[PDB]
């Protein structure tokens, strides 16, 4: 019950960071995935949007439905991060 919000605000501060645009790998880390199972699945699904996406405009809005604060400042940064995220996945897929 403590680690569900612990890994929640961790997912918030880690996703909103500008230095890390995706890092979808460590989102799957096995010790934190059980903590994500207790969390609501809108955060895990939008973390898959930042894992692959990119748009997926419904999920990047769904994280605004789920988390009101601190997202309004970094929202445009997330949009830029996924806009540069799809460039690797379009030639990689």
């Amino acid at each position: 019950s403590e680690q569900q919000e612990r890994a929640f605000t961790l997912g918030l501060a880690g996703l909103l960071g500008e230095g890390v645009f995706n890092f979808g790998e460590l989102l799957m880390h096995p010790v934190l995935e059980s903590l994500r199972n207790t969390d609501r699945q809108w955060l895990i699904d939008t973390l898959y949007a930042f894992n692959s996406g990119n748009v997926e405009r419904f999920q990047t809005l769904k994280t605004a439905w789920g988390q009101q604060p601190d997202l309004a400042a970094n929202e445009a940064q997330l949009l830029r991060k996924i806009q540069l995220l799809c460039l690797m996945e379009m030639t990689f897929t």
């Binding site: 790998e25 799957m28 096995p30 990689f92």
Partner: protein, 95 residues
């Protein structure tokens, strides 16, 4: 280097699947996800520019094989002429 490179990655990819089958945790993925994607970095085939490298490489072998035919003419000229000279001379003088 070729064949030992075949069985290297073979047995090494055999360990890649065996470690996932048995031995977990884990080994997947401290590096599994990134290393395997580095394997998926380059497939890597044409189109397009890789087709240009083809006949460009053909244009590269031009010069060397052209020179090869040049050495063929020079080696055949010298050796054959000089050998037949010293041959016909040794036979006609002794015989």
């Amino acid at each position: 280097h070729g064949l030992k490179g075949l069985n290297s990655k073979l047995l090494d990819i055999r360990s890649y699947l065996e470690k996932v089958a048995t031995g977990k945790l884990p080994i997947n993925h401290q590096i599994i996800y990134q290393l395997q994607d580095v394997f998926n970095l380059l497939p890597d085939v044409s189109l397009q520019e890789f087709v240009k490298a083809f006949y460009l490489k053909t244009n590269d072998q031009m010069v060397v094989v052209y020179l090869a035919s040049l050495i063929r003419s020079v080696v055949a000229l010298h050796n054959l002429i000089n050998n037949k000279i010293a041959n016909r001379d040794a036979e006609k003088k002794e015989g």
